[PDB]
Ligand SMILES: Nc1ncnc2c1ncn2[C@@H]1O[C@H](COP(=O)(O)OP(=O)(O)NP(=O)(O)O)[C@@H](O)[C@H]1O
């Protein structure tokens with residue numbers, strides 16, 4: 001229908017990442033790629049808060065303090081990459097950091113706490129099954145709210161919004177390596 | 189507390205360079221210097237990707253096919269040099285080729301086409317000013333390209349990168365890494 005460059009969504013992030021990193025005293029080099037990539041104009045408002053949340057998660061939970069990254073033998077400065085591109089009939093948006101990765105042990109503990117799984121079933125969960133708990137509505141306690149809709153935001157809300165746009169989301173994460181979240185939205 | 193010879197990352201290039209040259213129909217004499225230069229293990233592990241990008245750039249955009257160098261009145265075989273040395277409290281790595289050199293007019297034309305500068309302004313730019321457009325994200329055409337990825341990885345190591353080039357003489361990319 002009506003395509004516009006994704007820069008309408010991306011433009012405000014450099015400054016927000018700068019301030020967020022400074023507030024949580026993290027050294028972060030923010031990289032944005034493919035701002036010219038176009039998407040439906042009716043996706044602009046809705047995809048913004050969800051993306052901000054993924055960026056916040058990277059800065060807060062992913063990128064470790066300089067001292068910790070040096071101990072791990074990693075580049076002192078963490079890298080946060082926000083990218084967009086066209087891949088077939090879809091707009092692909094990625095948020096990737098080279099931080100400590102999602103604490104899967106913590107996710108399992110939370111899942112058990114929320115009655116989503118029994119402890120006997122947790123030992124054999126695959127990484128994908130574990131990371132997927134993050135998409136269960138109500139999984140995250142929440143606090144950060146969407147300046148657009150007004151609902152608290154967690155990975156569960158991110159997935160819910162992405163599904164509302166008829167798209168999908170996947171997560172990849174390895175301990176001390178980092179986390180990569182990929183969102184695929186339809187072109188039309 | 190973990191210095192290690194840069195040879196741990198340099199040793200893998202001779203074969204990469206040869207395969208790239210054959211793939212691109214370029215005849216290149218590859219030279220490596222200061223492979224005994226010690227630097228933080230971390231930098232050694234991370235600098236591989238960037239250096240590969242610079243070496244590939246030299247073999248692709250820089251070194252001209254032997255037939256062209258001959259026609260141009262230059263030594264038939266192209267020369268590509270990868271070196272490391274100490275300069276005060278910094279390790280300096282350089283990738284230099286004696287190719288055609290970065291086309292600065294091409295850069296200027298692109299900047300004008302993208303609306304970054306008008307013609308009058310383009311005429312007053314210094315060479316360094318022109319070359320730095322190569323670092324503007326998105327400036328260059330289609331994992332992340334070459335110069336953008338090189339500068340970002342280098343700066344994540346608290347390093348610095350500069351470019352130098354002369355038409356038909358060649359290009360030299362310099363990377364400065366801190367002492368740990
Ligand atoms: N050694 C060189 N000699 C001549 N031109 C060069 C050299 N290195 C870089 N360039 C020029 O600088 C521009 C950009 O290099 P870079 O950012 O690595 O992009 P790329 O080579 O076009 N594409 P990609 O293959 O994605 O990295 C090139 O497109 C060339 O025009």
Ligand SMILES: Nc1ncnc2c1ncn2[C@@H]1O[C@H](COP(=O)(O)OP(=O)(O)O)[C@@H](O)[C@H]1O
Pocket residue numbers: 057058059061062063097099100101102103106134139140141142143144153154155156179
């Ligand atoms: N990029 C990331 N790096 C490391 N951990 C992450 C990342 N993104 C999310 N997480 C982890 O997943 C859990 C939940 O994320 P989410 O549902 O967005 O909740 P929250 O809003 O509480 O930050 C987080 O509490 C954190 O432990």
Ligand SMILES: [Mg+2]
Pocket residue numbers: 241244245333334335
């Ligand atoms: Mg390149």
